[PDB]
Design a protein around this ligand. Structure first.
Ligand SMILES: O=c1ccn([C@@H]2O[C@H](COP(=O)(O)OP(=O)(O)OP(=O)(O)O)[C@@H](O)[C@H]2O)c(=O)[nH]1
Ligand SMILES: O=c1ccn([C@@H]2O[C@H](COP(=O)(O)OP(=O)(O)OP(=O)(O)O)[C@@H](O)[C@H]2O)c(=O)[nH]1
Ligand SMILES: [Mg+2]
Length: 297
């Protein structure tokens, strides 16, 4: 074992006792930037956390906090092929996502100053000082995806500066992660923290980790590890070993994992459009296993 049980147990832990405080401070500052803007305050816009601080899975002290700002006065939607869009109800509006993101960047500059705000491809970064963590503000619009039965699932949708349209389901993501954490006696998110920290260590001491293995991907993988592997073992060394074994085994053939979804369970994990592959995950599991140096016979 390249690492001891104490070290792994320590790395299953939040990087500060004030994580929720930082998240709520970022949420409040973004919400105030919204509410004290002349243009946006007159629009239905919900400010809420997403990502590692909202899932209590962050492992890097004062890493970026993700704050979604979701416009909901008009929603994008997607219908099955056997349904008409006209029959559902159409709405035309002079407002667009591009103008919304420009407005959000304007409000952020107004509240925090242009030198503190940095527009990026998928977000708008507010720089960290001594009182606030660096915050990625993510402007999105309401999004509905309808199924055959008439029910819809609700989420967020946005357009990158490079013109790519992205759909997300952050609320269902957080809800499902909370459910699994409850049903694992709070071991799911500890194992997620351990995996994230291990990825960072491997990248730091020189290891060759693929850029396709993201933190969101690691979280979705640990999400896909069945609860029994977390519940039915007694040390973190063994839970980690078994989770790696499971992910490796079920990523050797695309058939074993082509049905896995992300934490929201509303999008597939390996159905194209992703920057990773199941072979990428399998290679990463091999690299991590060889890094950990478990005892063998
Ligand atoms: O590919 C993606 C990436 C991101 N997202 C959505 O954007 C949220 C934050 O996107 P992040 O890339 O920041 O993931 P993370 O916060 O969990 O890990 P860090 O790198 O920040 O440490 C994610 O929680 C997810 O809801 C997706 O839906 N798909
Ligand atoms: O699908 C996504 C992706 C990203 N995000 C949010 O935008 C932030 C940007 O984080 P990313 O790392 O995913 O985008 P990038 O512009 O840095 O491109 P790469 O070179 O890293 O591949 C993320 O931290 C997340 O909060 C989403 O909300 N949804
Ligand atoms: Mg994040």
């Amino acid at each position: 074992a390249k690492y001891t049980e104490d070290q792994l147990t320590s790395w299953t832990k939040p990087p500060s006792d004030s994580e929720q405080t930082k998240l709520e401070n970022s949420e409040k500052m973004v919400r105030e930037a919204i509410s004290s803007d002349e243009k946006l305050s007159k629009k239905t816009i919900e400010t809420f956390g997403q990502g590692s601080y909202a899932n209590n899975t962050n492992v890097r002290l004062n890493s970026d906090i993700d704050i979604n700002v979701k416009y909901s006065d008009g929603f994008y939607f997607d219908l099955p092929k056997d349904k008409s869009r006209e029959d559902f109800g159409i709405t035309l509006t002079s407002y667009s996502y591009e103008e919304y993101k420009d407005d959000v960047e304007n409000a952020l500059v107004n509240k925090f100053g242009r030198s503190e705000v940095v527009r990026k491809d998928k977000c708008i970064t507010v720089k960290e000082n001594s009182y606030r963590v660096e915050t990625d503000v993510v402007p999105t619009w309401d999004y509905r995806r309808y199924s055959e039965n008439g029910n819809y699932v609700q989420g967020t949708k946005f357009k990158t500066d490079k013109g790519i349209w992205i759909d997300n389901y952050p609320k269902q993501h957080i809800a499902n992660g909370i459910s699994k954490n409850n049903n694992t006696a709070r071991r799911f998110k500890r194992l997620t923290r351990l995996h994230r920290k291990l990825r960072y260590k491997m990248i730091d001491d020189g290891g060759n980790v693929s850029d396709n293995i993201t933190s969101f991907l690691l979280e979705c993988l640990v999400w896909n590890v069945p609860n029994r592997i977390m519940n039915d073992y007694d040390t973190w060394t063994e839970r980690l070993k078994q989770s790696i074994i499971y992910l490796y085994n079920n990523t050797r053939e695309e058939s074993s994992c082509k049905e896995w979804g992300e934490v929201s369970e509303l999008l597939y994990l390996f159905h194209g459009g992703r920057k990773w592959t199941s072979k990428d995950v399998n290679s990463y599991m091999v690299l991590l296993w060889n890094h950990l140096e478990f005892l063998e016979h």
